[PDB]
Design a protein around this ligand. Structure first.
Ligand SMILES: CC1=Nc2ccccc2C(=O)C1c1ccc(Cc2ccc(OC(F)(F)F)cc2)cc1
Ligand code: FES
Lengths: 46, 441, 75, 59, 99, 239, 378, 64, 195, 415
């Protein structure tokens, strides 16, 4: 029922990274998980 | 044991105020973990033009040391006890909160207090965090969603404090002295403007006494900051930039603001129209006519309805991302939906909307953090936590007639604010958009 | 012909505007209107007018020349 | 009390169905008013010149 | 040389400068000009796009710019010349080769 | 072949919204009846046309009954003569143009139905012609029967001065001076050429008023819609 | 997705009357297209209503027209609307063309040439229309103008008698003039649709003469609302004539029936032909004069070839501006001279005006374009 | 008794009329004196009447 | 940053009601719409007034002209026709029979058989005055019936063989409908207008 | 009525676990051993299509009815795939669990996979993959596994390009009929009684039944000219369920496993500080720890500037070497334990994450281990076990994956 963290498009120009403060959190630390739904946008986790 | 019943035995929220005026609020349940934090009536709305982005600048400096714990001492202590420390700033609400083990709640409350009150704001640390903000500002330019919404506010509430971005202009970021920041803090961070919220395994009694121990020093006493109303303007902002591959459009009418009961019926209506993107399982068979039409005809890549609430006003509408040839058709079906709900919403579809909304806010409040946040912010917006049993009362009251009458108040024959960014050549002219806010029948 | 969305390539141009219900139909109509008209009239006058002055003259000359020609000459 | 234009909007102009009925009713009231009013202007402008003014002399 | 007095007069008489246009913006778009425009670098093209947008909007209001903002005669860079010259030079070569 | 064009007399119907003096028309009709209907035809005016203009239904019936007119054929196959009715047009003096020429020595008297519309100057012209008859200047004489009138083109006309003082006693007893007779007949000949005159001008007033109302309103609607564009500001923001 | 873009009939209307991308900056001179359409529809309606009461028989023709004005209910207001409507048509035409000339719209070749055709067709319609009342100027105007074709060697004399269907303008001529006059407006309507068809291929020129793709606005509401205002102004102008001075643009002699003996003093066509009538009378030789009258209109087809300026519109072109306004004032002079008797000084003025007309189009305005270019280092 | 012939007299005694009336009488006793020349005096009469009847128009209609 | 963009001041163009940046536009929204829509509504009423009149005139055009209305009616003098004799008239390009009827012809046509007639009409409803019968002249194939003749002593036709009575009703012949009763009214007891 | 978890393992192998907690909302999850690993080289990407394929027509409910009926009651139907498991999850208000259950059972036990529906769905593989691969972590982690393994765990979760448009209805039927079986299924629940779940599992989920992961050690290099280089270096770690795995988990948190403070400098993170000492340009580093039924991967993931990739990876690798050599104090291992202990309890804080852990455990192990037992097991890791885990990594056969402009990114045999 609830919309996701990030609304997903194809062909949409990538969101940039410029500093340490925005880049931390990104380094993968656990294996991938993928969810698909009826209501919620599709997400891929570390 | 039914749903109606289940709501009756949801843990109540405890409510108490300190001598200075700081509220302590807390929802309890035997849980090994907890979330606690401080919510403040402070943000960009409370900033003037010359001190815009100060609250954001502060947020950067918050976790960079205190008088009691200089530099990375505050940082080290949070990490080593397995605690998670986090912050956010909206146009009206700044908030700092910590996720910790239930046994570590005393130290958790202590650390929050140390952050708020005794924040270092070092000369070197300011000049460091200055470049950081400037780079985030550049990153933010590459988020079309962020840009279009900032534009919506900027045009909707033009010439007021609500037009202002949370981050502030690069001009202010480059100039803001430590004098500005400390002056901003002592003006806005006051006990009656703040709420200490916690959820998880916490005895309410203990939290309130910990609040005494560390938050007693908070000031609660000329020209007390009281936000003026903000003038909505029917306007358009069009950032045409054909170099970007997809167009972002954000459109809204004036919403009622936090207080108003109509917000419940508006949520029901917004749930009917709902949201969509290209990764959704539903496609053609989706219940929302906008979504099924959008899926079958590849109109947009994504859309959501949003009813953004501020104090005496807000933004009620939708955002979409679509192909450069689809903007006109997207606008057509979306405005078509607003009109259909205003004029001719059905009982069964409103019931669907109700059921969506019931489900929406029951499952959002799952885990200590979102429950802590609901406590913190509800105290700021409503002046209390509204129990789930009461939300349910308000939802059950909404029928087809209500949805019509409520939607007709805000949407029907009203001037919207439009923001567009990207290859927006097709994006309908304001007059055509304005004419799309009524039907001739 | 060509539909909106296929006309041309435009980059980095912002357009801000107001709803017609938020504004006046005739803002500074005489205040700014009168001077702009005088400016516009002065700008084109001695391109537009000289031929019509010439018409007036060739007309009034030719008309009363036809009258005088039909009079008898004193001889 | 709200302004006069606003009362006109809420009562007559908001629903396009009432807006249309308003035009039709108003057109009738306007038609008879305008016609009678403009004819009066004409007949006063031409006092005693029209057959309508000199009719009585031959009846 | 001596007619530079007339050139300066004509420039202001013509008056495209009052809309903040350069001479090369006012050229009637034939097939050569189209190609020449197409060959402009990002900067020169988007400038052209704005200047015209601005001019048309001014024409729509029946107004001109402030005199400070007028294109000065001497500041009118001949931006399209090198591209247009070569487009023409190219076509003339193909036309020659076709005989 | 010099030319004297007529002056502009201030008629009771000269102005934008000014109707014809119908009483004037009623007198003017009698000036046609008593004087010019033995020479000029007026084919497009019938006795019914007078009703609601200068005469009542009953008066116009009497005027119609006064005149001879041919009708037929009857069952025997003959053309009889009968008393006129409203449906009859004003009767021609002669059967044809050839007969007319013989009675006026070569010259044909023009039909008067459109004479105001068919001559430059109109009622100003006709009035000047009727009152302008005078003795010729030195060094001038025309063919025996062509009179001198200065307002006529070529300075010489083949009509005997038709109006003079007391040529007719008016029904309403207006003093029948040469001037007054001419004024009345012109007012009638104006109506003859243009019956619509009053209705036309009534419509003119109603059009001017509605235009006075609609033009600024439509213009305001125009400015309303266009206000979106009129206000707009453009900014050029390259990276 | 809507039923404006979808339905095969609405699709055509949506693309050519609603969502049509129009330049933001087009002036009042762009309203004349709309107004020409209104004129055409107005003529057709008023015309059809007149045709319900008119007869093309030479004996009853003049009578029927007067019967319209006297006995037919509001037949007068219909009649005088149609007559002044013909004047309004030509005013609208010349303004529409002037716009084309001044702003260089003629570069739209197909649109432009179809225009020339439309002009010529409206002229033919209005020439034969003026004959229908069967008054003096009707009959004698038709006689002199038609008979000009006899100046063609070998065939000309046959041709004239073939148009007439006899030896003068008589029974057979009036009846066919009515038939042609009825049918042609409908042909005009078709050719006018071909005219627009080509116009939407490019979209519209604007006052700057610079491409407006960077600033297109939707036709509705912006230009639907302007066109309504324009239409309202056209109705005012028309009805000002019809209700206050219906005979102002006509001639008195067309109120006396057509007489094959009695010649009017100064026989002439209706005002909108006077410029070309003057050109005819400048040349002393008759075949020369016909070829000049012909070339005075057909020269419009030459204009696009005669373009020399590197700029499209005259907006940024002082010398051309003046020569254009000279050409307009000259045409106003030819219209005046056209109305005059053939005598001194109207012959010499007329000759001089006719020389100036062709000189302006064929020599001076081309040279002015090239001078302007060389002044801009072009 | 006619208001017309009253006003014709009234207007006849104006500067432009009396000056034109003298012009008329000059050629009256120039032609009617001289023999064997085909020139006449229509022109001079029309000059006089133009000036006269313009004035007559201005106020004749008041007495009607 | 895009945060550097701030919307231009629109104060010059704003309506008075929306100038105050610290007050809500929602007060004036009811009103500002009202004003603009009034202009629109007024305009529509005016255009309606026009279109009514224009269309109405054009419709009028097609209706009977003044000269056709002139031949609509015919006046007949009743003292000019003697008791018993018929008198023919020309009406709408047709003959029109008016007949003065005697007290014998009235009573003789009063007690006639209702059923036996081909077109059953009683005499009291064929006329408005007893002593006057007004009729339009043969229903079969169009001739002009001759007065004071026939078997039934009224009107007889020498074309095929129709016999009309004194009330104008077909008695013995090929005609399908009786001679037609037009629309008329007596005005002065001396005069009749038919039409 | 204060409530704790109930548990049942039916004779047919199937697990039912359910906490009746009297919340207004009810989460139900059917967990299945049907992850990407059970694809072979002939049907690669089948489980990806299968993940997209719920809400296609079933025997008891149409494609239309699944969407409409669930949306009617404000519900959600989700499908989640790891390398080892698939998880079908429904949410709604507790009154509508019957309805949602019927939908869940239809989707998992009797999907029809109609030729026209399956074919129509094919383009969705491209959309879903395209979206996911916008995360550069997805590139590297999918490559990392493909490099590290010969067969099962090497499989990517997303369908290979060549297979898009080509996954057949037969393959989908085969995959479900072979993998969605009682011996491979765990039905978990919140806000519903255990007896009624048991009865559903007996009557509707009694389905009859239907190679070990060989570690390889390789490298995969995506040359793509980003100014940033994502890179991961791992060695084979231990299997989930073994005690050694807990040692790796502690080692992960000693080295640093993601941020604790917003915009924080990570003063306790061994890796982040090790890298930040030498190089101050924008970067991120974290310890990477996957653990599976057969195997596991442990190492670290760097995000660095293109030119700095050599320096960053080497510096990070050196930090593990010093932990392996023995440079490790109690306060570090204590902090690391406190992180992991807190992290675990926080991950099961929400009723979403709790359901994931109950189902997750139920498949890879026999039954539910309570939070208290788990934390005691974390404490049971001696400092010696942490140093052994580090030693294992350093001398163990290496696997690597990188994406970016790799001009200064070393190969495995360049370390
Ligand atoms: C089609 C148009 N294109 C434009 C392009 C650029 C700038 C202005 C315009 C227009 O003003 C314009 C238009 C013209 C006319 C009308 C009303 C109308 C009247 C008569 C008609 O009959 C026909 F014969 F077909 F012409 C049709 C329509 C509306 C709009
Ligand atoms: S025609 Fe007279 S009855 Fe047959």
């Amino acid at each position: 029922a609830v919309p996701a963290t990030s609304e997903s498009p194809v062909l949409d120009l990538k969101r940039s990274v410029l500093c340490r403060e925005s880049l931390r959190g990104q380094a993968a630390g656990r294996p991938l998980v993928a969810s698909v739904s009826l209501n919620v946008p599709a997400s891929v986790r570390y | 044991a039914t749903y109606a019943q289940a709501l009756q035995s949801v843990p109540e929220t405890q409510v108490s105020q300190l001598d200075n005026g700081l509220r302590v609020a807390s929802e309890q349940s035997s849980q090994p973990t907890c979330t606690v934090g401080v919510w403040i009536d402070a943000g960009s709305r409370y900033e003037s033009e010359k001190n815009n982005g100060a609250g954001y600048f502060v947020e950067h400096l918050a976790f960079k040391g205190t008088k009691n714990r200089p530099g990375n001492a505050l940082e080290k202590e949070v990490e080593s006890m397995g605690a998670h420390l986090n912050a956010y700033s909206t146009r009206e609400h700044t908030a700092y909160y910590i996720k910790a083990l239930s046994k570590d709640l005393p130290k958790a409350v202590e650390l929050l207090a140390d952050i708020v009150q005794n924040c270092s704001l070092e000369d070197s640390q300011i000049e460091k965090e200055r470049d950081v903000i400037l780079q985030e500002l550049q990153e933010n330019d590459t988020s079309m969603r962020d840009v279009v919404f900032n534009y919506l506010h900027a045009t909707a509430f033009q010439g007021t404090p609500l037009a202002q971005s949370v981050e502030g202009p690069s001009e202010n970021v480059r100039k803001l002295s430590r004098a500005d920041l400390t002056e901003y803090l002592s003006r806005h961070y006051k006990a009656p403007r703040m709420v200490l919220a916690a959820a998880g395994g916490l005895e309410h009694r203990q939290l309130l006494d910990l609040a005494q121990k560390h938050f007693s020093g908070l000031s609660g006493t000329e020209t007390v900051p009281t936000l003026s109303p903000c003038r909505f303007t029917g306007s358009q902002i069009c950032h045409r930039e054909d170099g970007l591959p997809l167009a972002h459009v954000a459109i809204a009418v004036e919403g009622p603001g936090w207080a108003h009961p109509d917000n419940v019926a508006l949520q029901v209506a917004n749930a009917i129209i709902g949201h969509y993107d290209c990764t959704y399982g539903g496609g053609a068979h989706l219940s929302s006519p906008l979504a099924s039409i959008a899926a079958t005809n590849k109109l947009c890549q994504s859309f959501q309805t949003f009813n953004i609430c501020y104090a005496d006003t807000g933004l009620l509408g939708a955002h979409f991302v679509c192909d450069h040839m689809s903007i006109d058709d997207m606008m057509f079906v979306l405005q078509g939906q607003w009109m259909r709900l205003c004029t001719s919403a059905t009982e069964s579809e409103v019931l669907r909307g109700k059921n969506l909304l019931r489900n929406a806010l029951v499952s959002h409040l799952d885990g200590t953090t979102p429950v802590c946040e609901d406590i913190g912010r509800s105290l700021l917006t409503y002046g209390r936590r509204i129990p789930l049993a009461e939300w349910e009362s308000r939802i059950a009251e909404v029928d087809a007639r209500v949805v019509r009458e409520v939607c007709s108040k805000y949407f029907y024959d009203q001037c919207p604010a439009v923001a567009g960014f990207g290859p927006i050549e097709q994006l309908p002219d304001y007059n055509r958009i304005r004419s799309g806010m009524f039907w001739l029948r | 012909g060509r539909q909106f969305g296929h006309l041309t390539r435009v980059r980095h141009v912002i357009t801000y505007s107001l709803s017609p219900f938020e504004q006046r139909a005739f803002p500074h109509y005489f205040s700014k209107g009168i001077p702009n008209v005088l400016r516009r009239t002065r700008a084109c006058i001695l391109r537009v007018a000289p031929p019509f002055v010439a018409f007036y003259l060739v007309y009034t000359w030719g008309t009363q020349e036809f009258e005088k020609s039909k009079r008898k000459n004193p001889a | 009390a709200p302004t006069l234009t606003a009362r006109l909007y809420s009562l007559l102009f908001r629903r396009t169905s009432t807006f249309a009925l308003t035009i039709v009713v108003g057109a009738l009231f306007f038609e008879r008013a305008f016609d009678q009013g403009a004819d009066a202007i004409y007949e006063h402008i031409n006092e005693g010149k029209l057959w309508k003014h000199i009719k009585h002399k031959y009846e | 040389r001596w007619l530079e007095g007339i050139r300066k007069w004509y420039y202001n008489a013509a008056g495209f400068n009052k809309l903040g246009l350069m001479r090369d913006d006012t050229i009637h778009e034939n097939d050569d000009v189209k190609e020449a425009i197409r060959r402009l670098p990002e900067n020169l093209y988007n400038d052209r796009v704005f200047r015209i947008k601005r001019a048309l909007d001014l024409s729509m209001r029946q107004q001109i710019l402030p005199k400070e903002q007028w294109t000065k005669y001497e500041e009118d860079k001949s931006y399209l010349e090198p591209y247009l010259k070569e487009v023409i030079r190219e076509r003339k070569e193909r036309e020659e080769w076709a005989k | 072949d010099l030319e004297l064009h007529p002056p502009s007399y201030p008629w009771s119907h000269r102005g934008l919204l000014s109707s014809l003096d119908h009483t004037s028309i009623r007198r003017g009709f009698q000036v046609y009846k008593q004087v010019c209907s033995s020479c000029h035809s007026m084919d497009y005016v019938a006795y019914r046309h007078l009703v609601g203009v200068c005469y009542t239904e009953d008066e116009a019936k009497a005027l119609a009954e006064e005149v001879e007119v041919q009708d037929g054929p009857n069952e025997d196959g003959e053309m009889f003569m009968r008393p006129g009715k409203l449906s009859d047009y004003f009767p021609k003096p002669y059967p044809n143009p050839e007969a007319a020429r013989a009675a006026n020595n070569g010259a044909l008297p023009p039909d008067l139905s459109y004479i105001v519309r068919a001559r430059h100057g109109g009622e100003d012209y006709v009035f000047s012609l009727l009152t302008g008859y005078c003795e010729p200047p030195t060094g001038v004489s025309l063919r025996e029967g062509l009179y001198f009138n200065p307002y006529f083109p070529g300075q010489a006309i083949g009509m005997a001065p038709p109006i003079y003082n007391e040529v007719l006693e008016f029904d309403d007893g207006t003093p029948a001076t040469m001037s007054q007779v001419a004024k009345d007949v012109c007012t009638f000949l104006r109506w003859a050429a243009e019956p619509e005159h009053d209705h036309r001008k009534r419509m003119g007033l109603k059009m001017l008023l509605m235009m006075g109302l609609l033009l600024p309103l439509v213009y305001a609607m125009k400015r309303h819609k266009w206000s979106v564009l009129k206000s707009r500001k453009l900014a050029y923001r390259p990276p | 997705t809507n039923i404006r873009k979808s339905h095969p009939l609405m699709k055509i209307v949506n693309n050519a009357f609603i969502d049509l991308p129009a330049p933001s900056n087009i002036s009042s001179w762009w309203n004349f297209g709309s107004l020409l359409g209104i004129c055409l529809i107005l003529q057709i309606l008023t015309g059809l209503f007149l045709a319900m009461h008119y007869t093309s028989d030479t004996t009853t023709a003049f009578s029927s027209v007067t019967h319209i004005c006297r006995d037919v209910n509001y037949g007068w207001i219909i009649r005088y609307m149609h007559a002044n409507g013909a004047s309004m048509f030509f005013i609208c035409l010349y303004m529409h063309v002037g716009r084309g000339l001044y702003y260089g719209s003629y570069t739209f070749l197909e649109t432009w040439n179809i225009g020339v055709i439309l002009l010529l067709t409206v002229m033919a319609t209005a020439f034969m229309g003026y004959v229908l009342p069967w008054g003096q100027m009707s009959f004698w105007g038709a006689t002199v103008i038609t008979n000009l074709l006899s100046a063609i060697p070998y065939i000309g004399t046959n041709l004239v008698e073939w148009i007439w269907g006899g030896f003068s303008v008589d029974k057979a001529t009036l009846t066919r003039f009515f038939a042609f006059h009825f049918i042609l407006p409908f042909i005009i309507m078709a050719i006018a649709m071909v005219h627009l068809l080509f116009l939407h291929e490019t979209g519209s020129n604007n006052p700057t003469g610079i491409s407006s793709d960077v600033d297109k606005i939707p036709f509705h509401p912006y230009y639907t609302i302007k066109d309504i205002l324009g239409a309202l102004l056209l109705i005012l102008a028309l009805m000002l004539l019809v209700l206050f001075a219906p005979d102002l643009l006509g001639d008195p002699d067309n109120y006396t029936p057509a007489n094959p003996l009695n010649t009017p003093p100064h026989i002439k066509p209706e005002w909108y032909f006077l410029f070309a009538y003057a050109i005819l009378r400048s040349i002393p030789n008759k075949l020369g004069g016909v070829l000049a009258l012909a070339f005075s209109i057909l020269i419009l087809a030459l204009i696009p070839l005669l373009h020399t300026s590197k700029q499209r519109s005259m907006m940024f072109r002082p010398l051309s501006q003046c020569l254009f306004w000279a050409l307009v004032a000259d045409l106003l002079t030819l219209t005046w001279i056209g109305g005059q008797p053939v005598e001194h000084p109207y012959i010499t003025i007329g000759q001089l005006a006719s020389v100036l007309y062709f000189l302006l189009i064929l020599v001076l305005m081309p040279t002015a374009g090239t001078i302007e270019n060389k002044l801009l280092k072009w | 008794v006619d208001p017309l012939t009253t006003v014709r007299e009234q207007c006849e005694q104006l500067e432009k009329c009396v000056k034109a009336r003298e012009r008329l009488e000059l050629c009256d006793e120039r032609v009617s004196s001289r023999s064997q020349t085909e020139e006449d005096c229509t022109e001079e009469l029309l000059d006089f009447l133009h000036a006269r009847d313009h004035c007559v128009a201005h106020k004749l209609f008041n007495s009607l | 940053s895009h945060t550097d963009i701030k919307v231009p001041d629109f104060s010059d163009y704003r309506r008075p009601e929306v100038l105050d940046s610290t007050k809500s536009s929602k007060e004036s929204s009811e009103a500002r719409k009202g004003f603009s829509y009034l202009v629109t509504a007024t305009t529509t009423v005016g255009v309606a007034y026009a279109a009514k009149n224009v269309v109405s005139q054009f419709v009028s055009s097609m209706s009977a002209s003044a000269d056709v209305l002139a031949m609509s009616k015919i006046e007949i003098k009743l003292s000019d026709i003697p008791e018993g004799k018929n008198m023919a008239f020309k009406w709408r390009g047709k003959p029109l029979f008016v007949r003065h009827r005697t007290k014998k012809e009235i009573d003789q046509e009063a007690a006639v058989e209702v059923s036996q007639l081909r077109d059953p009409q009683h005499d009291l409803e064929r006329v408005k005055k007893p002593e006057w019968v007004i009729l339009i002249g043969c229903t079969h194939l169009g001739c002009v019936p001759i007065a004071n003749a026939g078997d039934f002593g009224g009107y007889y036709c020498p074309c095929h063989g129709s016999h009309y009575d004194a009330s104008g009703r077909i008695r013995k012949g090929p005609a399908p409908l009786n001679l037609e009763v037009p629309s008329y009214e007596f005005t002065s007891d001396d005069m009749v207008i038919v039409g | 009525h204060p409530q704790d978890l109930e548990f049942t393992r039916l004779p047919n192998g199937l697990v039912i676990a359910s906490l009746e907690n009297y919340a207004p909302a009810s989460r139900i999850g059917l967990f299945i051993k049907a992850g990407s690993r059970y694809e072979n080289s002939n049907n690669l990407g089948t489980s990806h299509l299968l993940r997209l394929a719920s809400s296609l027509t079933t025997k008891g409910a149409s494609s239309f009815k699944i969407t409409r009926g669930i949306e009617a009651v404000g519900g959600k139907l989700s499908v989640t795939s790891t390398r080892e498991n698939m998880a079908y999850t429904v949410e709604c208000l507790r009154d509508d669990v019957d309805i949602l259950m019927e939908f869940l059972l239809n989707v998992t036990t009797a999907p029809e996979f109609r030729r026209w529906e399956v074919a129509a769905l094919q383009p969705q593989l491209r959309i879903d993959k395209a979206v996911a691969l916008q995360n550069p972590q997805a590139h590297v982690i999918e490559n990392l596994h493909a490099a590290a393994y010969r067969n099962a765990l090497a499989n990517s979760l997303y369908c290979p390009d060549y297979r898009i448009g080509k996954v057949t209805p037969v393959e989908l039927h085969d995959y479900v009929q072979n993998h969605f079986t009682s011996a491979r299924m765990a039905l978990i629940g919140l806000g519903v009684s255990h007896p009624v779940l048991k009865q559903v599992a007996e009557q509707f989920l009694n389905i009859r039944g239907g190679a070990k992961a060989k570690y390889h050690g390789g490298e995969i290099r995506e040359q793509n000219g980003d100014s940033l280089v994502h890179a991961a270096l791992v060695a084979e770690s231990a299997a989930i369920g073994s005690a050694e795995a807990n040692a790796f988990s502690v080692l992960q948190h000693v080295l640093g496993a993601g941020p604790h403070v917003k915009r924080g400098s990570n003063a306790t993170s061994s890796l982040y500080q090790a890298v930040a000492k030498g190089v101050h340009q924008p970067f991120d580093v974290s310890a990477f720890n996957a653990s599976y039924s057969d195997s596991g991967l442990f190492g670290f993931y760097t995000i660095s500037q293109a030119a700095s990739a050599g320096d960053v990876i080497k510096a990070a690798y050196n930090q593990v070497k010093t932990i392996a050599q023995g440079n490790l104090s109690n306060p570090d291992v204590q902090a690391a334990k406190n992180k992991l202990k807190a992290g675990y309890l926080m991950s099961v804080e929400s009723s979403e994450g709790f359901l994931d852990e109950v189902g997750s455990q139920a498949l890879a192990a026999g039954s539910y281990t309570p939070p208290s037992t788990v934390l005691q097991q974390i404490d049971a890791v001696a400092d010696a076990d942490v140093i052994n885990a580090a030693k294992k990594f350093v001398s163990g056969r290496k696997s690597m994956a990188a994406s970016g402009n790799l001009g200064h990114t070393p190969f495995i045999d360049e370390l």
